[PDB]
Design an enzyme around this catalytic site. Structure first.
Site, PDB file in Angstrom:
ATOM      1  N   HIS A  57      35.483 -43.253  19.855  1.00 51.63           N
ATOM      2  CA  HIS A  57      35.479 -42.121  18.936  1.00 51.63           C
ATOM      3  C   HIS A  57      34.235 -41.268  19.058  1.00 51.63           C
ATOM      4  CE1 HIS A  57      38.857 -44.009  16.931  1.00 51.63           C
ATOM      5  NE2 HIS A  57      38.147 -45.117  16.812  1.00 51.63           N
ATOM      6  N   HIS A  72      24.833 -41.195  16.070  1.00 52.34           N
ATOM      7  CA  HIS A  72      25.896 -40.713  16.930  1.00 52.34           C
ATOM      8  C   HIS A  72      26.066 -39.242  16.616  1.00 52.34           C
ATOM      9  CE1 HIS A  72      27.763 -41.692  13.081  1.00 52.34           C
ATOM     10  NE2 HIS A  72      28.481 -40.610  13.330  1.00 52.34           N
ATOM     11  N   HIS A  93      29.058 -35.824  16.513  1.00 55.69           N
ATOM     12  CA  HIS A  93      30.396 -35.263  16.579  1.00 55.69           C
ATOM     13  C   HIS A  93      30.246 -33.910  17.238  1.00 55.69           C
ATOM     14  CE1 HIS A  93      31.688 -38.233  13.531  1.00 55.69           C
ATOM     15  NE2 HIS A  93      30.416 -38.111  13.191  1.00 55.69           N
ATOM     16  N   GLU A 141      30.837 -31.470  11.509  1.00 56.85           N
ATOM     17  CA  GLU A 141      31.687 -31.950  10.434  1.00 56.85           C
ATOM     18  C   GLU A 141      31.367 -31.181   9.164  1.00 56.85           C
ATOM     19  OE1 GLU A 141      31.484 -36.349  10.707  1.00 56.85           O
ATOM     20  OE2 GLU A 141      33.416 -35.924  11.631  1.00 56.85           O
ATOM     21  N   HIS A 153      24.407 -37.657  13.338  1.00 55.79           N
ATOM     22  CA  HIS A 153      24.393 -38.510  12.156  1.00 55.79           C
ATOM     23  C   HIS A 153      23.504 -39.699  12.434  1.00 55.79           C
ATOM     24  CE1 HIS A 153      28.503 -36.881  10.746  1.00 55.79           C
ATOM     25  NE2 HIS A 153      27.485 -36.097  10.433  1.00 55.79           N
ATOM     26  N   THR A 187      32.745 -40.291   7.431  1.00 54.90           N
ATOM     27  CA  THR A 187      33.678 -39.274   7.887  1.00 54.90           C
ATOM     28  C   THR A 187      34.677 -39.831   8.875  1.00 54.90           C
ATOM     29  OG1 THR A 187      32.369 -38.581   9.772  1.00 54.90           O
ATOM     30  CG2 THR A 187      31.875 -37.548   7.631  1.00 54.90           C
TER      31      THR A 187
HETATM   32  C1  LIG Z   1      27.252 -49.098  10.490  1.00 58.38           C
HETATM   33  C2  LIG Z   1      28.688 -48.637  10.268  1.00 58.38           C
HETATM   34  C3  LIG Z   1      29.115 -48.956   8.830  1.00 58.38           C
HETATM   35  C4  LIG Z   1      29.665 -49.325  11.218  1.00 58.38           C
HETATM   36  C5  LIG Z   1      28.735 -47.130  10.360  1.00 58.38           C
HETATM   37  O1  LIG Z   1      27.786 -46.431  10.449  1.00 58.38           O
HETATM   38  N1  LIG Z   1      30.020 -46.553  10.355  1.00 58.38           N
HETATM   39  C6  LIG Z   1      30.091 -45.153  10.293  1.00 58.38           C
HETATM   40  N2  LIG Z   1      31.396 -44.728  10.208  1.00 58.38           N
HETATM   41  N3  LIG Z   1      31.331 -43.213  10.016  1.00 58.38           N
HETATM   42  C7  LIG Z   1      29.984 -42.881   9.978  1.00 58.38           C
HETATM   43  S1  LIG Z   1      29.625 -41.173   9.705  1.00 58.38           S
HETATM   44  N4  LIG Z   1      30.458 -40.215  10.788  1.00 58.38           N
HETATM   45  O2  LIG Z   1      29.999 -40.868   8.331  1.00 58.38           O
HETATM   46  O3  LIG Z   1      28.188 -41.143   9.923  1.00 58.38           O
HETATM   47  S2  LIG Z   1      28.945 -44.069  10.155  1.00 58.38           S
HETATM   48 ZN   LIG Z   2      29.324 -39.352  12.046  1.00 55.49          ZN
END
Ligand SMILES: CC(C)(C)C(=O)Nc1nnc(S(N)(=O)=O)s1
Ligand SMILES: [Zn+2]
Length: 257
Positions: free
Chosen positions: A61, A91, A93, A103, A116, A195
């Site tokens: 993803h 990471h 997007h 986002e 993020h 997200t």
């Molecule tokens: C550490 C853990 C819970 C696996 C995580 O960070 N998961 C996320 N899933 N979406 C994220 S976002 N795009 O809101 O930053 S982070």
């Molecule tokens: Zn994210």
């Protein structure tokens, strides 16, 4: 399984993850004229000097740069936060075109990408517990626009060839995430969610006002990644962003006038 295609994308996620239609979903549009300056908001404390990056993973993803979060090495504190939040991973997007990819949006403007930096509240002991709490995570969101290169991003860009496909990881030690920050730590903040599925409503969002600039070549290399695994038909990892969700009963607060 959920993703970003026509048949499994954000408009479908609610079927497996009903919280997708919840009361504090992310991302949101940041309407800058409606966000209210909150003078009680403290400056962010971004303490990344001791950060220990370990690995970079294409999870199908996005790609995650993971950190050693078994001690308070790289932490986020202050701002709207109570207590200490440990950096676990960052990471991005991003879009298929420079005019989309973020986002969060700002007055409906989409940026080319959004970084993020994910942190979990140490009072909950592990991130798996933290995500079950309304204040379990703090995600620092940073917009990317295309212009000049971001020198501190290049080490990330150059390893992507080694994690082209889902499930590939590579050693990624000694990366300094301070090189991804803009000059200003002025921010907007609001309570939201992951997200991506499971879309848990556990995030204090802290979105920096100042984007970082990255070069066209840098973002083009993001777009060469693959959603698919090795030996599968190639699907470029692009447009891995969830669109803005209803703000509902939330006020976005600004750290700056
Ligand atoms: C550490 C853990 C819970 C696996 C995580 O960070 N998961 C996320 N899933 N979406 C994220 S976002 N795009 O809101 O930053 S982070
Ligand atoms: Zn994210």
């Amino acid at each position: 399984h959920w993703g970003y295609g026509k048949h499994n994308g954000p408009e479908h996620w609610h079927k497996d993850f009903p919280i997708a239609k919840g009361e504090r979903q992310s991302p949101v549009d940041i309407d800058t004229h409606t966000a209210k300056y909150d003078p009680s908001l403290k400056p962010l404390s971004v303490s990344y000097d001791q950060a220990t990056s370990l690995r970079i993973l294409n999870n199908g993803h996005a790609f995650n740069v993971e950190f050693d979060d078994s001690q308070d090495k790289a932490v986020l504190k202050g701002g709207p936060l109570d207590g200490t939040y440990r950096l676990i991973q960052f990471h991005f997007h991003w879009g298929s075109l420079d005019g989309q990819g973020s986002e969060h949006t700002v007055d409906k403007k989409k940026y080319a990408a959004e970084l993020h930096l994910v942190h979990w509240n140490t009072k909950y002991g592990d991130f798996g517990k933290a995500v079950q709490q309304p204040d379990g995570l703090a995600v620092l969101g940073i917009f990317l626009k295309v212009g000049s290169a971001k020198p501190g991003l290049q080490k990330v860009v150059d390893v992507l060839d080694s994690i082209k496909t889902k499930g590939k990881s590579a050693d990624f030690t000694n990366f300094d995430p301070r090189g991804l920050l803009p000059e200003s730590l002025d921010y907007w903040t609001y309570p939201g969610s992951l997200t991506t599925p499971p879309l848990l409503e556990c995030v204090t969002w802290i979105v920096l006002k100042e984007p970082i600039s990255v070069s066209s070549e840098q973002v083009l290399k993001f777009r060469k990644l693959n959603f698919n695994g090795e030996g599968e038909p190639e699907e470029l990892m692009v447009d891995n962003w969830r669109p803005a969700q209803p703000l509902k009963n939330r006020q976005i607060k600004a750290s700056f006038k």
